[PDB]
A = this chain, B = another copy of it.
């Protein structure tokens, strides 16, 4: 009656995550001066290069060189010895205004509450009572392992560490009436970029004793836990030099780690009129509100939109059998309590605030009491 499930996470210096952070740094910079900026900023990273590509219509005056370079500095890529340096990399910009055809279809001449969805699409929200963060344990652990790497790099404990890292956690679970109950960590993978001087045994020892043991509750570890620590044997070349980065290339890391579902919409570099972002945030908020309200233990919420249309086209609720209420009753509760138009979500979740760079590593969900992580008290 047990099953395995695996999730992964990446660190701040993973090339895809560099792009997500830069795109959201660019978005925040616009929003700081123009709360109504229309932003759709993709970032591409390869050896020595940050390229911004996409569409921005805004009143803000933004110094892209500064914004990009400060983001890469925060990540820690500050010397050619590390494979990338904010001081001396190439920053190229291919940014145009938003298509006027889109603008006229979505928001021009509309009352804010009634703005159309910025695109079509489908979005899911998920919550699970298995952790206090209402998130899968597999992904929560994976994220914390990367955060611990960054901490130890930054505080000088493990000065051989670089910014690019990946982690993966397999948990063995049992189920109870459709809820899931973690039993033990089955397998942990950690790969992290490193300097030329440190040997593999020192790294593997440090990853076990200073990272894994510092993060994973000991009740979940036993003698049969499998560790794959620096399994490649060598990871000196890293960041964009080792592997190309794109914005929106970590959508599963950003969300639920393989649990629930995903509609395909990336978050980073988009203002609230992009329902890929605002409706996914709202959907998480719905799902979390249902669980923390005691109406279910686990729940998946789907919504979907058409470009130019303000109201969702479909809402669906799946409770995995973890409620005494029917799924149709939960749907009636959601419909009574939430207004999932983007022009209303923006007010409920304060989505014109320039806090997006903070979302762009370690997952958008399950941390920091962002507005979509504060449950709505439900009337029913």
Which A residues contact B (CB, under 8 angstroms)? 3-8, 40, 42, 44, 46-49, 51, 53-55, 61, 65, 79-81, 83-85, 87-94, 96-97, 99-102, 104-106, 116, 120-122, 124, 166, 168, 170, 186-187, 189, 191, 226, 228, 231-238, 241-244, 246-253, 258-264, 266, 302, 304, 306-309, 313-316, 318, 327
Q: Which of A8, A79, A266 has the most CB of B within 10 A?
A: A8
A42 to chain B: which residues have CB within 8 Å?
Answer: 44, 244, 246
Q: A243 CB to closest chain B CB, in angstroms? A: 7
Q: A152 CB to closest chain B CB, in angstroms? A: 20
Q: How far is the CA of A261 from the CA of B61 in the complex (A)?
A: 41
A92 to chain B: which residues have CB within 8 Å?
Answer: 49, 92-94
Indicate if the CB atoms of B90 and A90 lie closer than 8 Å. yes
With A91-B94, A170-B304 already in contact, 17 other A-B pairs whose C-beta atoms are closer than 8 Å: A6-B313, A44-B51, A47-B94, A55-B243, A80-B87, A85-B88, A89-B90, A92-B92, A100-B237, A105-B234, A106-B232, A189-B307, A232-B307, A232-B308, A246-B249, A248-B249, A251-B251
Contact with A314, one of B4, B93, B309 (Cβ below 8 angstroms): B4
- Sample (28) of A-B pairs whose CB atoms are under 8 Å apart: A4-B314, A4-B315, A47-B91, A47-B94, A48-B91, A54-B244, A80-B88, A83-B88, A84-B88, A89-B90, A90-B90, A92-B92, A101-B235, A101-B236, A102-B243, A105-B231, A105-B232, A105-B235, A116-B231, A122-B168, A168-B304, A168-B313, A187-B313, A226-B313, A228-B306, A231-B307, A246-B248, A258-B263
